[PDB]
């Protein structure tokens, strides 16, 4: 009846698009515009192709590339549908400029001439799949690890922090770490390779002292891995020390205190009537939330920063503090599914969605927000 609704998440590095209602994404392609100079369709050929990213750290840099990216996202490769005869729902990042949000709908009403549009907050959509009103949505993709606090369907822009450490930075940390270990890899040639190795064997440990101990003393953390060239490398403690920059951002020469310290200093910096509520509902969504062992470390450090500062040494008064974080099994793309749910729910619900006629008559900023 509504001419097929859809949902598209255009992230920094990985774009995930799926039909509304789908429990997963119906197409997941790498976000990179490629050009030739000689006489997942672009990622296959990158050694001899000039690749560019339209969405830099969440924001769009080159509209001439973003337009073609949209034409390739709605093209006969992944979606294969008419933009003028189908509605859509895009995902936006927290702390985004009003100019960006305006230009988005502007280009979605004029360039693509869509008949339907429905934007929503990624921090809100990520919790929407979990079915909650108040919670902490922390997104760590390839651009930046922004920590957003949501409450009653809204996010305090004065409470939304951000750590400049992303999956790309994890890759660079792993590739830098392996070099010291004795091996040798290139900064640009084996980029995706290093990213894969990190995605595979690397992780985040709970007890850094005990993990370092297990690595130095025992030979149980050391695992082997085969490369594309056929040669094999054996990485040990480098597996965990590389992702450990997520907890302490001083290991990569960055300004900040750490994701755990950021979340904790943003938790105690809330209303005292909401402090016991926001500490019991924290949603983990983003590519960097698939690192085996992040949940335990977050819970532990969050426990530390509310027992050294909130309890101030009081051991007995530590148990009373609620501590419950949920690492969902489908947390890898909660932003997408959360949309795929919303777009399925508000498919034909009243008329709370931007129209083309309302975008052609008047108001490119026709946004009830």
């Amino acid at each position: 009846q509504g001419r097929k609704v859809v949902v598209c998440d255009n992230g920094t590095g990985f774009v995930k698009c799926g039909y509304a209602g789908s429990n997963f994404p119906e197409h997941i392609f790498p976000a990179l515009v490629g050009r030739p100079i000689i006489r997942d369709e672009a990622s296959e050929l990158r050694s001899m192709l000039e690749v560019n990213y339209p969405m830099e750290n969440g924001i769009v840099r080159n509209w001439d590339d973003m337009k073609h990216l949209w034409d390739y996202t709605f093209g006969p490769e992944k979606l294969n549908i008419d933009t003028r005869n189908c509605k859509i729902l895009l995902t936006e990042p927290p702390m985004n400029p009003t100019k960006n949000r305006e230009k988005i709908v502007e280009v979605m009403f004029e360039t693509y001439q869509f008949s339907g549009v429905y934007v929503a907050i990624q921090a809100v959509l990520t919790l929407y799949a979990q079915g909650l009103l108040t919670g902490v949505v922390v997104d760590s993709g390839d651009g930046v690890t922004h920590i957003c606090p949501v409450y009653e369907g809204f996010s305090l822009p004065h409470l939304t922090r951000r750590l400049d450490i992303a999956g790309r930075d994890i890759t660079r940390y792993l590739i830098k770490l392996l070099l010291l270990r004795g091996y040798a890899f290139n900064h640009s040639a084996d980029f995706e390779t290093v990213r894969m190795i990190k995605e595979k064997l690397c992780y985040v440990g709970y007890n850094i002292e005990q993990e370092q101990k297990l690595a130095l003393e025992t030979t149980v953390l050391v695992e082997s891995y085969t490369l594309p060239d056929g040669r094999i490398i054996k990485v040990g403690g480098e597996r965990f020390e590389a992702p450990e920059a997520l907890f302490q951002p001083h290991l990569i020469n960055v300004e900040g205190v750490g994701v755990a310290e950021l979340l904790f200093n943003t938790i105690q910096a809330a209303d005292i009537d909401t402090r016991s509520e926001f500490y019991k509902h924290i949603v983990l969504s983003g590519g960097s939330t698939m690192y085996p062992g992040l949940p335990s470390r977050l819970e532990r450090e969050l426990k530390q920063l509310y027992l050294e500062r909130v309890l101030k040494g009081d051991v007995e008064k530590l148990s009373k503090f609620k501590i419950r974080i949920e690492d969902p099994p489908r947390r890898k793309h909660m932003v997408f599914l959360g949309g795929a749910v919303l777009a399925d729910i508000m498919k034909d619900k009243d008329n709370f969605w931007m129209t083309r006629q309302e975008y052609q008559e008047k108001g490119v900023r026709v946004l009830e927000k």
């Binding site: 949940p295 949920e326 690492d327 099994p329 489908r330």
Partner: protein, 339 residues
């Protein structure tokens, strides 16, 4: 006495089909394999790569023809056959942290894990989704082995807390009420009906009888302990000179067979008269090993006959060999073995 060399690595879980026509197993991998039997040689037919880690538990609902599986992937998959492809459905376990078995009712499954909470789970047809309520009362450790009783309302499980408790995971929204059992009258979801008295050794094995009168379990203190509610929940233990047992199952109402780190399937009988357990002996008598499997047994299910009169015993171990046993051949071999 029919051992089949399938792989070189160890085995995780052993499952069978309704008519025992197909067998399913996992080889400590991110995927689970399903093989059938076409003649003397066996050949693989299905492969499921849904889980994202080493598969720990897997059980197949016979009448329902539907196999559920849950392991290190911190998730559960209620796989059902869809045409020529086994489609898996992600049943949320809701656990922040190694066992699974369907009920006799084949309507809800128990998922005992390291979250110190026996996560029972039924299928809500109202929301077209699986829900998992967690029974965590009086539970201090992971659920090694979980086995149902004939009531399909009371579950038994051994823990790393050196005890084998028999609690109730009865969801009153998926079945009718439960009749009065000898193990108690008050049966509520989360209510602890029974427990062990051991303070040593881990309860790696646990299985209830067919009559539902007695519940036995194997502890890792080189000791096996069977309890009978027929004699006011009397507990009868016995220390084996052999190593610890890993899996425990009953062949008859008074005769059980079990193996483990001893790497050799053993038989035992418990006299209701005196009220004590007795050892039958070594049913598996013949690398360098003196037995079929070159490692410890890891699981032991029943092929056909029931827990009152098993005609064939299926044994999976850490040796990578499928040990198919028969009570008839075993009784024809060892003449000094009273079942």
């Amino acid at each position: 006495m029919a051992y089949h060399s399938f792989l070189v690595e160890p085995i995780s879980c052993h499952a069978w089909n309704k008519d025992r026509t197909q067998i399913a197993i996992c080889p400590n991998n991110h995927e689970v394999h399903i093989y059938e039997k076409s003649g003397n040689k066996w050949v693989q037919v299905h492969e499921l790569k849904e889980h994202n880690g080493q598969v720990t538990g897997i059980d197949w609902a016979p009448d329902s023809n539907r196999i559920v599986t849950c392991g290190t992937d911190r998730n559960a998959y209620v796989w059902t056959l869809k045409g020529r492809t086994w489609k898996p459905t992600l049943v949320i376990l809701r656990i922040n942290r190694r066992c699974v078995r369907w009920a006799p009712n084949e309507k809800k499954f128990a998922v005992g894990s390291g979250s110190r909470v026996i996560s029972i789970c039924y299928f809500e047809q109202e929301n077209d989704w699986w829900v998992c309520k967690h029974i965590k009362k009086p539970i201090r450790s992971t659920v090694l082995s979980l086995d149902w009783h004939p009531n399909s309302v009371l579950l038994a499980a051994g823990s790393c807390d050196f005890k084998c408790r028999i609690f109730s995971a009865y969801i009153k929204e998926v079945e009718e009420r439960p009749a009065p059992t000898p193990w108690g009258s008050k049966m509520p979801f989360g209510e602890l009906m029974f427990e062990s008295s051991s303070s040593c050794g881990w309860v790696h094995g646990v299985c209830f009888s067919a009559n539902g009168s007695r519940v036995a379990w194997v502890s890792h203190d080189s000791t096996v302990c069977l309890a009978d509610a027929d004699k006011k929940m009397a507990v009868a233990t016995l220390a084996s000179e052999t190593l610890p047992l890993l899996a425990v199952t009953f062949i008859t109402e008074s005769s059980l067979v079990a193996a483990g780190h001893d790497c050799f399937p053993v038989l035992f009988t418990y006299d209701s008269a005196a009220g004590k357990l007795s050892f039958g002996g070594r049913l598996d008598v013949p690398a360098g090993l003196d037995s079929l499997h070159k490692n410890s047994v890891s699981q032991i299910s029943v092929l056909s006959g029931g827990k009152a009169k098993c005609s064939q015993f299926c044994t999976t171990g850490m040796d990578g060999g499928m040990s198919i046993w028969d009570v008839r051949s075993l009784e024809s071999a060892l003449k000094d073995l009273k079942i």
